[PDB]
Amino acid sequence: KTDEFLKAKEKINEIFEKLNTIRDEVIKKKNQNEYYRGRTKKLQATIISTKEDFLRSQEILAQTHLPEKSVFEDIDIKRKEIINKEGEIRDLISEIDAKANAINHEMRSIQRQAESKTKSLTTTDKIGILNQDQDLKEVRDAVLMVREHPEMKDKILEPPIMTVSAINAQFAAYLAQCVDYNTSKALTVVDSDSYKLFANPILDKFKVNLRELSSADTTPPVPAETVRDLGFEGYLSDFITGDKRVMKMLCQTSKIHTIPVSRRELTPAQIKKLITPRPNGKILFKRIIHGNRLVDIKQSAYGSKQVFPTDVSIKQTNFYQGSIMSNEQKIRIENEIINLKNEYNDRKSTLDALSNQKSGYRHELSELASKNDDINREAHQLNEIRKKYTMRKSTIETLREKLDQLKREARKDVSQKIKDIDDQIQQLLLKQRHLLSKMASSMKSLKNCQKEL
């Protein structure tokens, strides 16, 4: 029709190119084969290294490295020793609680012993006289009120039986019969008229007395030192000790101003010097204080100036305390008991000190328990040594169980690909042969077409 056969050749060239591609695949697969042989070299190196590593790591187990049940049994055993620590701690806590309780039980006695030390001599406070009776306790509260009412204190002070002081009760007796005890428990006016200015509370809120002057001829209360006649020893107001206003209080409020004092059991023997009105502005010779008794003399306005007698004795009793008999009664009632309690106080403080020495023994036991717990922490250093050697043992087990899977996988995983390479080689063997046959089969469809050219 058009061209005879020259449009037929291309087949041989195409099959030739396909054979060339088969050759390229051959070389590629061979190179892959030498690549997997390199993989074989790598896995051989890995196994030869890891086998020796395992052999030596396994030999690491041949050393002593002795374990024992003590891995937990020692800690369990020392549980009871730390419990002994706890028991000693609570026992010591109880002991120091006893220490504190004893300290408090002793502080009150310490306060009392200090108070007694202050009370070792003349009254610390006068108010102690009135503790004996209910109405005397009303007087105590009245004393507290006047201490709460200073304007009624600086004008009517506390009772003369309170403020006044002396060497002893017998010397305080200078002021014991010239004024009755009932009058004696009356608050101490400073100047005459303070009575009317400050009477109310003492006589209505509480129930005690007060008094007012009898005369006010303020001159030397007795005619000169010749008054020291019967052996009279001196001046009453100054022989007793107290405030000047207190001293002037009773002068004629209770007829004591003009009274000499003397230990001698004297008497107002001047009676015969006085059969006469003889007032001269004064009523001196009515009353005096002498020894431990008292005689009394009158001077009547109606009388013809021949007097009649009266007398009372002075009691040595619980009046006019500058102290509890100064020493006598206190020696037994307070001093003896408080000195015995001072011995008791030293004994009790030293018994608390011996309790603190018991506490010291168990303080030493507490430091010893902490130190033995630290010795068990040295045993814990040993425990950490053992547990770190168990750390090394378990690490080598981890390494060897890792190598166990490493060898098992590496020995086959990639090495088995030689099957794939072999199959590819078989495919190449088949392809080359059948395609060579195909190429040879085209013959006589060739240029041999000169039948029609």
Binding site: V26, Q44, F54, K407, R411, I421, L436, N448
Partner: protein, 197 residues
């Protein structure tokens, strides 16, 4: 009007395929004789086609060819099975259609390894009467090129003429597969000795 050398090119194509096969066999291959027979079929069929094409070079139903296969290059195919057997073989044919003594060597064990400087032959060339082989090695320049007598071996069996030494591809082919197979056993044994202990 002719188109000829395409078929010399296809000759080269089949030759390069033979060179591919000669060293591509896997260690797991069992027998090659069917492969040898198929390459024989293709090679000789292309040889017959060589006459079928040349029948018109002198210039259908032309004169019969009558040429028969008697050329040297046919040797490239003969030997492969006896390389597959074991390394003990010596095979270059030239004369004998069958093995050296038609089965056996028995000729004095000069081997892959050089007779004196005992290394494997790596660049050899053969002479097609004597079978002497050298790599142009320390025997290179004794009396090289003077082929009347005294080729470097005592009491040989002929006077010689100058063709130096010529092509022989058999040499390293037997070495390749033999070394591969022998080293595979060592690899497998060294593996299994330590594999999963």
């Amino acid at each position: 009007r002719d188109l000829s050398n395409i078929y010399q090119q296809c000759y080269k194509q089949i030759d390069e395929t033979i060179n591919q096969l000669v060293d591509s066999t896997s260690p797991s291959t069992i027998g090659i004789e069917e492969q040898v027979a198929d390459i024989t079929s293709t090679y000789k069929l292309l040889s017959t086609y060589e006459s079928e094409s040349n029948s018109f070079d002198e210039h259908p139903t032309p004169e019969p060819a009558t040429m028969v296969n008697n050329t040297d290059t046919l040797k490239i195919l003969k030997v492969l099975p006896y390389i597959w057997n074991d390394p003990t073989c010596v095979i270059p044919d030239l004369q004998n259609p069958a093995d050296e003594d038609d089965l056996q060597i028995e000729g004095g064990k000069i081997e892959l390894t050089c007779p004196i400087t005992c290394k494997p032959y790596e660049a050899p060339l053969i002479s097609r009467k004597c079978n002497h082989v050298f790599d142009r090695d320390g025997i290179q320049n004794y009396l090289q090129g003077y082929t009347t007598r005294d080729c470097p071996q005592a009491a040989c069996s002929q006077v010689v003429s100058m063709r130096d030494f010529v092509r022989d591809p058999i040499m390293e082919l037997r070495c390749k597969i033999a070394k591969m197979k022998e080293s595979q056993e060592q690899d497998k044994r060294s593996s299994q000795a330590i594999d999963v202990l």
